Amino acid sequence: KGPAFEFAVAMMKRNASTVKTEYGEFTMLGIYDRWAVLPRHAKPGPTILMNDQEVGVLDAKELVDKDGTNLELTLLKLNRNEKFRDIRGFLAREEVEVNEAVLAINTSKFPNMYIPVGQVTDYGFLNLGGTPTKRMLVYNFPTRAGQCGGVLMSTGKVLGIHVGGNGHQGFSAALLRHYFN
């Protein structure tokens, strides 16, 4: 479990922020240039609060697959000068399964917390919040509101973004490299 945690802490420090939209408070991972990712249910408007600062949103893309099925991710392009360190090389081209993963959260409710969530399985199809959804990764741990946008990692890999769950079951949207240019 140790190297996953070492990787996770360094990744959050360099690429993560805390974001508020009108729909809640989230962990947000910057990906490259001015592109970042949120859960689709964050519903970012024309501005967001990023580390307590108003930042304009230049574009937002709610991702669906080639038949229009929800992936529960929104990509957003921010109006800011600082560029994210490019982490596209840490994103797989297809869903990753691992024996040990770490879920990293940074919000006002969960300030820099890391959770060893155990094994991650490619669950696939889920009806999530009433919406047919694909590319779900599942893991078993005691889930909580406020963990969405949390970053699911293993050693040297960013696997996905936490988007949902119930009870002791959590789900991430797989974060695939082709979603980005």
Ligand X SMILES: *[C@@H](CC(=O)OCC)[C@H](C[C@@H]1CCNC1=O)NC(=O)[C@H](CC#C)n1cccc(NC(=O)c2cc(C)on2)c1=O
* 162 is annotated as an active-site residue: no
Q: What end-to-end distance do the CA atoms of the chain give, in Å?
A: 32
66 forms part of the interface with ligand PI (CB under 6 A): yes
Nearer to ligand PI, 51 or 131 (CB): 51
Of the candidates 41, 54, 62, 95, the residue annotated as catalytic is: 41
* 72 is annotated as an active-site residue: yes
Locus of tokens 């408007």: 45
Locus of tokens 């949207």: 173
118, β-bridge pairs: 101
50 forms part of the interface with ligand PI (CB under 6 A): yes
Quick note: the x/- pattern for ligand X over 35-74, rule CB under 6 A, is ------x---------------------------------
What H or E segment, with its residue span, contains residue 12?
Answer: helix 2-15
Chosen residue from 33, 51, 125, 131 binding ligand PI by CB under 6 A: 51
Locus of tokens 């990712």: 37
Of the candidate spans 45-53, 88-96, 145-153, 156-164, the one that interacts with ligand PI by CB under 6 A turns out to be: 45-53
The reply, when asked if residue 100 is annotated as ligand binding, is: yes
- Pairing relation of β-strands 157-166 and 24-32? unpaired
> ∠153-181-16 over CA atoms, to 5°?
35
Q: Name the residues annotated as catalytic.
A: 41, 72, 148
Residues at the site binding ligand NH4, with contacts judged by CB under 6 A: 21-23, 43, 45, 112
